[PDB]
Design a binder for these strands. Structure first.
Ligand SMILES: [Mg+2]
Ligand SMILES: [Mg+2]
Ligand SMILES: [Mg+2]
Length: 802
RNA sequence: UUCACAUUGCCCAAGUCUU
RNA sequence: CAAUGUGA
C-alpha cells in the first residue's frame, strides 16, 4: 500500500500534434558534490538574514576555508562543487554583520552520477536528496537578487510601473522548479505576477489609502473614520527610517500632542534629532513591540520595499490586476521565452560552479489528440451529439431521461418594482418552452408564486410549501443579486427540509436567452433525478464490462490568513453504469489538513448506496483525487488507500475490488503550446481539447500524464496532470487516458468537455456548498460544524450540488 | 445565484529576527 | 465557491 506502479506502457491513441513545453533541458555533470550541515546562533532569524550571514561568512573567511563558490538553502544546507578543508570535523566560526556564530559539519557526498542512473532505467527510483541539491544551486542567486515567494521570484519591473492604488502595485516574476523527466533534468519556468506594496513615503501611502490628491488636504487631524481605514492598511507592514520596523498600531493623538515618558513626539524630534515636523497634525506609527512606546512620525518613514500584499485586493485592484497580466497562449509563450533568454542562467556564477548548463529553448514534445466520445441523448429521436473542439450543443436533442414537472413553485425575493409579475410570467413562458424542447416538460403553471423579503421569510415560506403542496418537485427562487438569502435558501432546502431549489438572478429573469435557459434546465433535470445524457455505451472502454464505481474526492482549505476555519472534505460516487448519476458525502475536518480524515466512513456510505441503486457490487474502484502535490503523495496514499480497503473489508468478506488511485492536479506550472501556428484554436490560441502528453516531460519511472480535456476560451489553458499512485486493475496507458477523457464529458452542468473528470468536479461543488452552509458559523465545536454540513435525509441521495 | 474557461485565494512550498 | 475578466 505504498510505492506507485511503474508506467505500464505508452499511449498510442489519437493523431499526433507538435507541442512546446515550458520545460528547459538541463545538462548535469556526473560528479560528486559535497553536502554540509550548518547552524547559526541565534536561529530565529529570517531565511534571508541567514543567507546574509553565510554570504559574508564565505568572503570573510575566503582564505584557509573558501578559496570556492558554495550555495546555501537559507537554513542548514550548504553545497560545494569541490570539498573543503573539513573532514567530519566541526568548525566554529564567528561572523559579523551590520554578532553570529556559525558551525559547519560535513554530512555526505551527493553523486550526480546516481541521478543520471535514476533518470535512466538503471536505478529503480529518483534520489530526492540529489534533486534537492540541484534546486538549491538554481535558487541561490535569485533568492538574494529577487524577492522569493514560494517557488517563484518577484521584482519591480524596470522602467515600468503598474499601480493598483491603495499604495499597491504589480510586480512581475517567474516560477522556477527542477524536475526529473523521461529525457533529462528539466528547469520548469513560468511567468507570474502578484501585488506588492509600493516602497514610498508613508505620507504618500496615506494619500493613496484615503484617496487624497495630495497632503495638505487637509491640515486638520484625521477623522477617526480616516484614521481607522489607514490603520487597517498599514498595520503589520514594515517601515524604515538603516533601521527597519514593523508597524503594530497607529496612535490616536497627533504627533504634536502624542506623548511618551523619557514629552510629545513632535517635541522629541525637535530636540534630539533637530527635525521640525511639516505635518504635526497627523498621528504617529507605533512600531516594534506593541507593549512599548516607540512612536515614529509619518514624515520620516518609508514603506520598505519587497513586501507582498497578503490582504485581498479590492474589486478595482483585481480588475486592474487582470488587465495587466492577461495573456493569450502565444503571448504567454513569448513572455516565457523572452524571460529565459534574458535570464541568462548559464552566466550565473553559482550555476557554473556546479557545471550546470540550461537550454534557452522550450523542449519539444509530441502529444496526441484523443478522439472525443459520442454523447447519447433520449426522446424518440435518440440523437447522438459529436463534440467538436471540446464543445457540443443540445439543439434538436432531448435528455436521456427527462423529468416531467407537474408541481412547482416560484419564490421571488427580488423587489416587485424591479422584478415584475410580467417579468415572471414571461420568464415562465420561455422556460416552459425550453423545457419542452429539452425533454423535461414543465406541464403547467406554478402552483404557488409569491414575493417575499429577507432571509427571515425563507424557512416559513418553504415549510408552508412542503405541507401544502403534495408531490412538490421544485422551488424556483428569484434573487435580486448577491444576497445572504441564497445561503439561507440552501440551508433550508438542503439541510432542514430537504427540498429541491433552483435559484436564478433577477437580471437573468428580466432578460432571458435560449442558451441560459437551456443551461438552467440541465441543472433542474439533474436535481429532479433526471439523466441529461450518457456516453455512447458501445464506445466506452472495456472497464465497463464489469461493475465499477467512480469516486471523486477533494479538500478545500480556508483562505489565506485565516486561522481557525475548518477544511472541508468531499467525496462523490457514481450510482449507475453510464456513468451519470452521483451521490455525495461531505465532512468538516482539521484546519488545513489535506488528508481526508473520515474517508473510510464516506466510501462505505457510497458503496452501500451504489448497491442499492444498481444491485451490483463494484469489482473495481476508480478514485480520482484532486489537489495533492507530489510532496504529499506518500502521506495521502498511505491513509486514503487503506481507508478505501477498510471500507470494503468492513462491508463484507473478502470483498476486495481492485483500486485505481489517481491524483488530479490542475494547478501546477506546466504549460503546453502549439508548435505550428495553424494548430492553435480560437482567439486564445490554445492547444485543442483532447491533447495528451505522456512522454518526454513526464515522470521517468512512474505512471503519469498530462491531459488537456477542455477548450481554452481565454488565457493559457491549464493542462490537467494525472498521476497513478495505485493500480490493482492494471490499466494500460491508453485505457486510462481514454477513460479519464470520457469522464470529462459526463459533466451534467454544460454541453462541454470540462478540465477535470466529472467526479472530481462534483467533489468541488460539494465542498463549496458545504462552505455556504457554514457561512458565518466557522469536539463541541466540531459537532456544531458537522451538523451544519449534514444534509436532510431526502437530500442524501440527490445531486443537490448541481 | 445559467454555464464553462482564465487570474488570485487552498495541501506541499513560502512566510513568521531609544520613542 | 468569492472577486475580476473572456466567452456561449
Ligand atoms: Mg483542494
Ligand atoms: Mg509548511
Ligand atoms: Mg466568476
Amino acid at each position: 500500500a505504498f510505492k506507485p506502479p511503474p508506467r505500464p506502457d505508452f499511449g498510442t491513441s489519437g493523431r499526433t500534434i507538435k507541442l512546446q513545453a515550458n520545460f528547459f533541458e538541463m545538462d548535469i555533470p556526473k560528479i560528486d558534490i559535497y553536502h554540509y550541515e550548518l547552524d547559526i546562533k541565534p536561529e530565529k532569524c529570517p531565511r534571508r538574514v541567514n543567507r546574509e550571514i553565510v554570504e559574508h561568512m564565505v568572503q570573510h573567511f575566503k582564505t584557509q576555508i573558501f578559496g570556492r563558490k558554495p550555495v546555501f538553502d537559507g537554513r542548514k544546507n550548504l553545497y560545494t562543487a569541490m570539498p573543503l578543508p573539513i573532514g567530519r570535523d566541526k568548525v566554529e566560526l564567528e561572523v559579523t554583520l551590520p554578532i553570529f556564530k556559525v558551525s559547519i559539519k560535513w554530512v555526505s557526498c551527493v553523486s550526480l552520477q546516481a541521478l543520471h542512473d535514476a533518470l535512466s532505467g538503471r536505478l529503480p527510483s529518483v534520489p530526492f536528496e540529489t534533486i534537492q541539491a540541484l534546486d538549491v544551486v538554481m535558487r541561490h542567486l535569485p533568492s538574494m537578487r529577487y524577492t522569493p515567494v514560494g517557488r517563484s521570484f518577484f521584482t519591480a519591473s524596470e522602467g515600468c510601473s503598474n499601480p493598483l492604488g491603495g499604495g499597491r502595485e504589480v510586480w512581475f516574476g517567474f516560477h522556477q522548479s527542477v524536475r526529473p523527466s523521461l529525457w533529462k533534468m528539466m528547469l520548469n519556468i513560468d511567468v507570474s505576477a502578484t501585488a506588492f506594496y509600493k516602497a514610498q513615503p508613508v505620507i504618500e501611502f496615506v494619500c493613496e489609502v484615503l484617496d487624497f490628491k495630495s497632503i495638505e488636504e487637509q491640515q486638520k487631524p484625521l477623522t477617526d473614520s480616516q484614521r481607522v481605514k489607514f490603520t487597517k492598511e498599514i498595520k503589520g507592514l514594515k517601515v524604515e527610517i538603516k533601521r527597519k520596523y514593523r508597524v503594530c498600531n497607529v496612535t490616536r493623538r497627533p504627533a504634536s500632542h502624542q506623548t511618551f515618558p523619557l514629552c510629545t513626539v513632535a517635541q522629541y524630534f525637535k530636540d534630539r534629532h533637530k527635525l521640525v515636523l511639516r505635518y504635526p497634525h497627523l498621528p504617529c506609527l507605533q512600531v516594534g513591540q506593541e507593549q512599548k512606546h516607540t512612536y515614529l512620525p509619518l514624515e520620516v518613514c518609508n514603506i520598505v520595499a519587497g513586501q507582498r500584499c497578503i490582504k485581498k485586493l479590492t474589486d478595482n485592484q483585481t480588475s486592474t490586476m487582470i488587465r495587466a497580466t492577461a495573456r493569450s497562449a502565444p503571448d504567454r509563450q513569448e513572455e516565457i521565452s523572452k524571460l529565459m533568454r534574458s535570464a541568462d542562467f548559464n552566466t550565473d556564477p553559482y550555476v557554473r560552479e556546479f557545471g550546470i548548463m540550461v537550454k534557452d529553448e522550450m523542449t519539444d514534445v509530441t502529444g496526441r489528440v484523443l478522439q472525443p466520445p459520442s454523447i447519447l441523448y433520449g426522446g424518440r429521436n435518440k440523437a447522438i451529439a459529436t463534440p467538436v473542439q471540446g464543445v457540443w450543443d443540445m439543439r434538436n436533442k432531448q435528455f436521456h431521461t427527462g423529468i416531467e414537472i407537474k408541481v412547482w413553485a416560484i419564490a421571488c425575493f427580488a423587489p416587485q418594482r424591479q422584478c415584475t409579475e410580467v417579468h415572471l410570467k414571461s420568464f415562465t413562458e420561455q422556460l416552459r418552452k425550453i423545457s419542452r424542447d429539452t425533454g423535461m416538460p414543465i406541464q403547467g403553471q406554478p402552483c404557488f408564486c409569491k414575493y417575499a423579503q429577507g432571509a427571515d421569510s425563507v424557512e416559513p415560506m418553504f415549510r408552508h410549501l412542503k405541507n401544502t403542496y403534495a408531490g412538490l418537485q421544485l422551488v424556483v427562487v428569484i434573487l435580486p443579486g448577491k444576497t445572504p438569502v441564497y445561503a439561507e435558501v440552501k440551508r433550508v432546502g438542503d439541510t432542514v427540509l430537504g427540498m429541491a431549489t433552483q435559484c436564478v438572478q433577477m437580471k437573468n429573469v428580466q432578460r432571458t436567452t435560449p442558451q441560459t435557459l437551456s443551461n438552467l434546465c440541465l441543472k433542474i433535470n439533474v436535481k429532479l433525478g433526471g439523466v441529461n445524457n450518457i456516453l455512447l455505451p458501445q464506445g466506452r472502454p472495456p472497464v465497463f464490462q464489469q461493475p465499477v464505481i467512480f469516486l471523486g474526492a477533494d479538500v478545500t482549505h480556508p483562505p489565506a490568513g485565516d486561522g481557525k476555519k475548518p477544511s472541508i472534505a468531499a467525496v462523490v460516487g457514481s450510482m449507475d453504469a453510464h456513468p451519470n448519476r452521483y451521490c455525495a458525502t461531505v465532512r468538516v475536518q482539521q484546519h488545513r489538513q489535506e488528508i481526508i480524515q473520515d474517508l473510510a466512513a464516506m466510501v462505505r456510505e457510497l458503496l452501500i448506496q451504489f448497491y442499492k441503486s444498481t444491485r451490483f457490487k463494484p469489482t473495481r474502484i476508480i478514485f480520482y483525487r484532486d489537489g495533492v502535490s507530489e510532496g504529499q503523495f506518500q502521506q495521502v496514499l498511505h491513509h486514503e488507500l487503506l481507508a478505501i480497503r477498510e471500507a470494503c473489508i468492513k462491508l463484507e468478506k473478502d470483498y476486495q475490488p481492485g483500486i485505481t488511485f489517481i491524483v488530479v492536479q490542475k494547478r501546477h506550472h506546466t504549460r503546453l503550446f502549439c508548435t505550428d501556428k495553424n494548430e492553435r484554436v480560437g482567439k486564445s490560441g490554445n492547444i485543442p481539447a483532447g491533447t495528451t502528453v505522456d512522454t518526454k516531460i513526464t515522470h521517468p519511472t512512474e505512471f503519469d500524464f498530462y491531459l488537456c480535456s477542455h477548450a481554452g476560451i481565454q488565457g493559457t489553458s491549464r493542462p490537467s496532470h494525472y498521476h497513478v499512485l495505485w493500480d490493482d486493475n492494471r490499466f494500460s496507458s491508453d485505457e486510462l487516458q481514454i477513460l479519464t477523457y470520457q469522464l470529462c464529458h459526463t459533466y451534467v452542468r454544460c454541453t462541454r468537455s470540462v478540465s477535470i473528470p466529472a467526479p472530481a468536479y462534483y467533489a468541488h461543488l460539494v465542498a463549496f456548498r458545504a462552505r455556504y452552509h457554514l457561512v458565518d458559523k466557522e469536539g463541541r465545536d466540531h459537532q456544531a460544524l458537522a451538523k451544519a454540513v449534514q444534509v436532510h435525509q431526502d437530500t442524501l441521495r440527490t445531486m443537490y450540488f448541481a
